[PDB]
Amino acid sequence: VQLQESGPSLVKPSQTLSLTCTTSGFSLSDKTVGWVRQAPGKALEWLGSIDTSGRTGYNPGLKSRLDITKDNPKRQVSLSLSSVTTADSATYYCTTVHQQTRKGCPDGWSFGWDCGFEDCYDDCTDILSSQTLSPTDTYEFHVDAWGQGLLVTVSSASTKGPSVFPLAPSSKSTSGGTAALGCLVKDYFPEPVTVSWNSGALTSGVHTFPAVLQSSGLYSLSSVVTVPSSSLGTQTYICNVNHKPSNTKVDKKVEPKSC
Amino acid sequence: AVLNQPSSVSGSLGQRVSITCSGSSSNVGNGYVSWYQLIPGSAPRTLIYGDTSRASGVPDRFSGSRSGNTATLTISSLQAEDEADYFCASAEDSSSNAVFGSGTTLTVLGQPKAAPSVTLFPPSSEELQANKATLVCLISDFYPGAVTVAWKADSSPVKAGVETTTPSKQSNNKYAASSYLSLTPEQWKSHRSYSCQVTHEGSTVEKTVAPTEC
């Protein structure tokens, strides 16, 4: 089961955020698709879903700004969130959800059909003096599969692609047999940026740090890798920076210094 | 509209740990609580559904239970990979109206202490030719996750241009942090050296770079 969120990484305040989830491996007439988000430092928050019959349900506190539709042949579900503010900056997840409404009677109480014959009865023997209670509906919810999520930032600031600079190894970054080298990913907006090394061939000993929000309103981060000091003369090291908010990818070769 | 969870829960490796989730008769009392695990850098993962049933791949040490309007997630023996944020959830008044818990951060204690490795990079020639200068102090492989970072220009304290990230865990379960000193090319060239000094527990490590040395 695949769930792929798509849409803008940046939306201006008061505008309408529109996202799409492309699905695979199941039928939208068999599974219900829901939306969940998480704002920075906050808890998971339900948005809404559209079920196998096409019925929509929403978070009551957000219903005035939400709309969810689906296209069964195109296998896509769409979410719209109008009049956005910075409280709507969050990671938005497409999900498959279990939703069921169960109708039942309390302990001991049984339906009129169960008592031997649509209301709940206590004494099935003395049906003449038994009380007729309407059933209490129970509701079942859980998230089945989670998409990877799409980070959305609400801001009036403009998109900016990153500048990538090498953090070159020298005698001052070597620890005998190993050496640290990296890339500085400077001055981009909005988040996020991901960094790989040598097109994903180099994975051991990598750490990409979280970004700083500088006073300029732009983010910067670094990614570092520990390599054998003996390889610095012969092995090539390239950091691959991806900034989807600007449709930018940068590869930067990190050359060791002769110092 | 959230279910009440403790904000922080901690335990040592091997210890029993429980996370509670208190709601009302209109949510948790419905009797179908779910539980979710969020590890930074990973999408959320469903742990429990229907009060007690484990999702696919969830280890047996995770159990869920419910007593009235309060649900509990229990780890019988805490292991290193359980360090994460945990969220309960339940429908309310409708199967399509989900309320998540306020969230619990689980910290697993017991791993060995580790002194930080510090690398200080001077501004690259590419950045200097672009009329900018950033010194990058990278701090890695330490535990516990608290350091203090200070900068020097020559031997004098740096009082401007510094930005430092909060420590966060590497893939080897140790902590790393980064600190940046933004300068003009003039400031960089005019001093004899700059230093990043990192204090962790009872030690300080200072790394120094100089414009004349490269």
Numbering used by the authors:
A (entry chain H): 2 to 82, 82A, 82B, 82C, 83 to 115, 121 to 262
B (entry chain L): 2 to 9, 11 to 27, 27A, 27B, 28 to 95, 95A, 95B, 96 to 106, ...
Paper quotes:
The cow antibody repertoire contains a unique subset (~10%) of antibodies possessing ultralong CDRH3s, which can reach lengths between 50 to 70 amino acids. Ultimately, we isolated a total of 8 and 11 cross-clade nAbs from cow-485 and cow-488, respectively, all of which had ultralong CDRH3s, suggesting only ultralong antibodies were responsible for cross-clade neutralization detected in sera.
The ElsE Fabs all have CDRH3s with 54 amino acids and 4 cysteines, with a 1–3, 2–4 connectivity, Bess7 has a 61-amino acid CDRH3 with 8 cysteines (1–6, 2–5, 3–7, 4–8 connectivity), while the 55-amino acid CDRH3 knob region for Bess 4 (6 Cys, 1–3, 2–5, 4–6 connectivity) has no ordered electron density in the crystal structure. Ultralong bovine CDRH3 knob regions fold with 3 short β-strands connected by 2 loops (Loop1, Loop2) of varying lengths that can adopt a multitude of different secondary structures, including loops, helices and β-turns. Flexibility in the stalk is evident in a comparison of the ElsE family of structures that have similar CDRH3 knob sequences and structures, but very different orientations of knob domains with respect to the body of the Fab. The ability of the knobs to twist and rotate with respect to the body of the Fab likely enhances the ability of bovine Fabs to access recessed epitopes. There is no convincing electron density to indicate tyrosine sulfation modifications in any of the antibody CDRH3 regions; however, BLI experiments indicate that Bess7, with 3 tyrosines in CDRH3, contains one or more sulfated tyrosines. Low sulfate occupancy or flexibility in the CDRH3 knob region may explain the lack of electron density for these groups.
